[PDB]
Amino acid sequence: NCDWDKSHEKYDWELWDKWC
Structure with missing residues (x-):
């Protein structure tokens, strides 16, 4: 998604790092 x-x-x- 990002x-x-x-x-x-x-x-x-x-996880936001990858869930931008």
Whole structure:
């Protein structure tokens, strides 16, 4: 995805690095 951050239902705080 990398199209959402700190808002997505699957978004991850730490994993954010790859879940940008």
